[PDB]
Design a protein around this nucleic acid. Sequence first.
DNA 1: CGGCATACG
DNA 2: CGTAG
DNA 3: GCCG
Length: 325
Amino acid sequence: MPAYACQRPTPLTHHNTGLSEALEILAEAAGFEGSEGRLLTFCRAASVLKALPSPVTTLSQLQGLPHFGEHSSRVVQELLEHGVCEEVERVRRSERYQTMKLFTQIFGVGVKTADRWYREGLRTLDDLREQPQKLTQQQKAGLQHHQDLSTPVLRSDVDALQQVVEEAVGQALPGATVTLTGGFRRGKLQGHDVDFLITHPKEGQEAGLLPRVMCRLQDQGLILYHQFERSFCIFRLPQPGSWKAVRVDLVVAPVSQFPFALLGWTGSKLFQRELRRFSRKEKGLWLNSHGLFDPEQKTFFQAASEEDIFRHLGLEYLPPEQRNA
DNA sequence: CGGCATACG
DNA sequence: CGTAG
DNA sequence: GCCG
Ligand SMILES: Nc1nc2c(ncn2[C@H]2C[C@H](O)[C@@H](COP(=O)(O)OP(=O)(O)OP(=O)(O)O)O2)c(=O)[nH]1
Ligand SMILES: [Mn+2]
Ligand SMILES: [Mn+2]
Ligand SMILES: [Mn+2]
Ligand SMILES: [Mn+2]
Ligand SMILES: [Mn+2]
Ligand SMILES: [Mn+2]
Ligand SMILES: [Mn+2]
Ligand code: NA
């Protein structure tokens, strides 16, 4: 088992779901306390289990697996022996964890804001609604739409949103294309938003595109909230005899950068952090969603495909459905 | 021990 | 500060 | 919390 998640296939469904979910609770709790190092180890340990070919049934099977030390091994041991890990259950039921999860789920609220509200004594969404003056416009939108934004986005929703984004993109710039990214590109059947990447085959023609797309979507009455090359939107999506709010992210890249943007925006988040970590620490190359830079020669790699990028980095190619780290 | 992704709004 | 994978 |  290789140490970086970008070195191994990780499918969306696997054979250690319960174990991975438990470790991810501890990772999330570490993030709420600002312990990014511990968050990463617990996330990486969970991801290792997702990549295994069969269920872990005995502690012996963890020996030699990367990212499994005393703490993560004890969590697995308790789940194997008793079906529950006391530390995990204590986190789950804790007021701090439950409130930080609720608050950070709000669009416009991060860990730092959630923590400050927690320390002020705030605990519920109605607590926040009862002091609306200390909210940003983004937070007000996130709070107004929070219930709809809690409802899973389904594949049927994705198909409908793609067609309306394409219509607006087509009037904004004939020939521009729309690619589904994020978790749906990795094969998820549900999600909490929809991610799209927009480009044009003629380098430079994409300049100024996103404002034109947004204006057109807004004139069609489809935009409940928006704030350039990245737009974090709330879209009005039709439903039987009504509609629901859906988070949509729209991103534009020039065609020269499209493979890097497609790779970055297809995720998973952990996969991309691991891929960038591998690039820098193992290969001496700096990777982002615009390109791949050699800081010794002072040059950018050209890529025409995701396959090119994996080759540049000396990694076997993984299709999106195997990037579910 | 230091490091832990790397951006844009 | 928020957001993104 | 774990790795190198
Ligand atoms: N309002 C609300 N937001 C939720 C709820 N559950 C999760 N979220 C939000 C918090 C996270 O920012 C986000 C996670 O969404 P997904 O699991 O679809 O993944 P995400 O789109 O971040 O990445 P992905 O595109 O799959 O790589 O959803 C919920 O019950 N209510
Ligand atoms: Mn410990
Ligand atoms: Mn025991
Ligand atoms: Mn997404
Ligand atoms: Mn998104
Ligand atoms: Mn850019
Ligand atoms: Mn996300
Ligand atoms: Mn520590
Ligand atoms: Na949030």
